[PDB]
Amino acid sequence: FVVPDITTRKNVGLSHDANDFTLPQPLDRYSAEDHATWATLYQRQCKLLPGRACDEFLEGLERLEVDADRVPDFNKLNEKLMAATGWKIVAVPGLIPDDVFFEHLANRRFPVTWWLREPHQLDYLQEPDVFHDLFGHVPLLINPVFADYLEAYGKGGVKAKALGALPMLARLYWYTVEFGLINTPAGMRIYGAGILSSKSESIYCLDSASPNRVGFDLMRIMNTRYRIDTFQKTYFVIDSFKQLFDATAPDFAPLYLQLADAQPWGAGDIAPDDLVL
Ligand SMILES: N[C@@H](Cc1ccccc1)C(=O)O
Ligand SMILES: [Co+2]
Ligand SMILES: [Co+2]
């Protein structure tokens, strides 16, 4: 009744560092099928995302020379990424402990799951994979304000861990880095990686009247649950990456303590103070 999960299967014969969870990218393990899956996913998103993704995202794909036709060589991408904002990507086996993830970000390393979904999982994979982590997350690292936000978020891990507040930080990450929307004069656009790599959440999040699109509010967000197994019911909207960086700059310690005994909002709740857009 129990079978090895995709993370376990993909990593057989491989190792990882016991402290930081990294390994050299195993290039020999990508089959022709992997490159074809990558090319299909990349083509699909590049057709769907113009006028949906924020323009910075599309520019990042191009400036970083993210390969269209094969899984990218992480070292090669790093040459461009390092020159831009002093970040690099590191390969990891899949999901890693929160404190290790934060320590990477604090040091301007972005952890990327090395392996790719199988063609049968083309439409959707639950686990992060190299398409979601690299295509979805990495292009916005060219934006210096976004990159500074990620670094600051990483640095925030130490205080959060010490206060038992990692789930509150996780909610902020989920509702920004993973599933954030950004308002523009041309209309709302997408910056969250979990939407940018998705087959159809990119359509729903902008085109459907169903989800609630709520103005960013730090306390609301850190008090809001999310689910990992369907489309989001609430998206939070920033006005700029600068607004995001500034709103998250103050001391979170009093915010964590006030939220500690609070009843969190459900993934589909509208709070009394929400700016609903
Ligand atoms: N300002 C937060 C750190 C942080 C920065 C950016 C994003 C998330 C958290 C703190 O006091 O710990
Ligand atoms: Co292990
Ligand atoms: Co992600």
Swiss-Prot record:
Disulfide bonds: none annotated. It catalyses: (6R)-L-erythro-5,6,7,8-tetrahydrobiopterin + L-phenylalanine + O2 = (4aS,6R)-4a-hydroxy-L-erythro-5,6,7,8-tetrahydrobiopterin + L-tyrosine. CDD domains: pro_PheOH. The keyword Iron applies. It comes from Chromobacterium violaceum (strain ATCC 12472 / DSM 30191 / JCM 1249 / CCUG 213 / NBRC 12614 / NCIMB 9131 / NCTC 9757 / MK). The gene is phhA. Belongs to the biopterin-dependent aromatic amino acid hydroxylase family. This is Phenylalanine-4-hydroxylase. The keyword Iron applies. GO terms for molecular function: iron ion binding; phenylalanine 4-monooxygenase activity. Fe cation binds at residues 132, 137, 178. It is an enzyme of class 1 (oxidoreductase). Its EC number is 1.14.16.1. Signal peptide: none annotated. Pathway: Amino-acid degradation; L-phenylalanine degradation; acetoacetate and fumarate from L-phenylalanine: step 1/6.
